[PDB]
Amino acid sequence: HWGYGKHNGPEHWHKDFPIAKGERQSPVDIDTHTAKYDPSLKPLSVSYDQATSLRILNNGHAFNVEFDDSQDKAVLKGGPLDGTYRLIQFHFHWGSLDGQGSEHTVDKKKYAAELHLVHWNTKYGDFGKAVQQPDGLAVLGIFLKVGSAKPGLQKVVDVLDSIKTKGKSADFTNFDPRGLLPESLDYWTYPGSLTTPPLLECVTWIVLKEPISVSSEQVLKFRKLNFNGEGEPEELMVDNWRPAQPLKNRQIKASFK
């Protein structure tokens, strides 16, 4: 099964998922100088006031905080998007060291981690149908750098001991994802893919310019999770990031100058 180890990591994924060598794969390096400012890009609309988190799950490749997406409770609109996209889950990718961990890079710079808030286009009715469409998902990507703590992340950090191993889930209600957002919603955007198998080319990527800062203790607790299931040999869940993929025939647009 695919993973991030020596024999099943990202360079192996194309054998099971040939779209890995596709024309709109993610993540990518964001060359800030080559990104073009687009004045027709609208500001992003993040409407998270009514979000209903339900639980948190270790799926063996990251942990997902899952939301009730059966109504327009937490939605993303505006920006490059047409229509309304509902938040279904968020998760992170992170490194074994503070110097790596993000999937997107900015002028080749790697951040300590990257948060992905995953949304699906309501015109397709549910997530499973949306991922089959070229405009099915909008993923809001937010970089994490190590510095001061992010208070809004602590409730996530504190529950991770209850989902250490693959397959464990925990009730995780009343979590407000607004506590994970930076001050500015300036963004880059490009058409891309899921960054884990099945690598489907269904994502409008919206990557925020401004990182959030989290503490060293906060990211250290991510690194205590396990890829393995309980009662299997312990392999720390670290470096669960795919490296940058060829931009090919794509242009990254910026909402700011």
Ligand X SMILES: NS(=O)(=O)c1ccc(O)c(NC(=O)NCCc2ccccn2)c1
Q: Which residues participate in catalysis according to the annotation?
A: 61
Which positions from 32 to 61 touch ligand X by CB under 6 A, shown as an x/- string? ------------------------------
Nearer to ligand X, 5 or 151 (CB): 5
Asked if residue 198 binds ligand X (CB under 6 A), the reply is yes
Residues lying near Zn ion in the complex (CB under 5 A) are found at 116
Give the one residue of 53, 102, 121, 196 binding ligand X; rule: CB under 6 A. 196
Least distance (Å) between residue 203 CB and ligand X = 6
Instruction: Map the footprint of ligand X across residues 111-150, applying CB under 6 A.
Output: 116, 118, 131, 139
Rounded Cα distance, 120 and 86, in Å: 5
Least distance (Å) between residue 19 CB and ligand X = 12
Give the one residue of 84, 195, 226, 245 binding ligand X; rule: CB under 6 A. 195
Nearer to ligand X, 138 or 153 (CB): 138
Going by the annotation, the residues of the binding site for substrate are: 195-196
> What is the CA 211 to chain-centroid distance, rounded?
13
Which positions from 175 to 194 touch ligand X by CB under 6 A, shown as an x/- string? -------------------x
Question: Tokens 């779209």 — which residue?
Answer: 19
Q: What is the dihedral of CA 48, 55, 94, 87, to 10 degrees?
A: -30
Rounded Cα distance, 5 and 13, in Å: 11
* Pairing mode of beta strands 212-214, 169-171: unpaired
Q: What angle do CA 156, 191, 45 make, to 5 degrees?
A: 55
Least distance (Å) between residue 233 CB and Zn ion = 25
Q: Render the burial of 66-94: b for 16+ CB within 10 Å, e for the rest.
A: bbbbeeebbbbbbbbbeebbbbbbbbbbb
Residue 9: phi and psi, rounded to 5, are -80, -170
Nearer to ligand X, 8 or 215 (CB): 8
Q: Which residue is nearest to Zn ion (CB)?
A: 116
DSSP-derived letter for residue 136 is S
Residues that bind ligand X (CB under 6 A): 116, 118, 131, 139, 194-198, 203
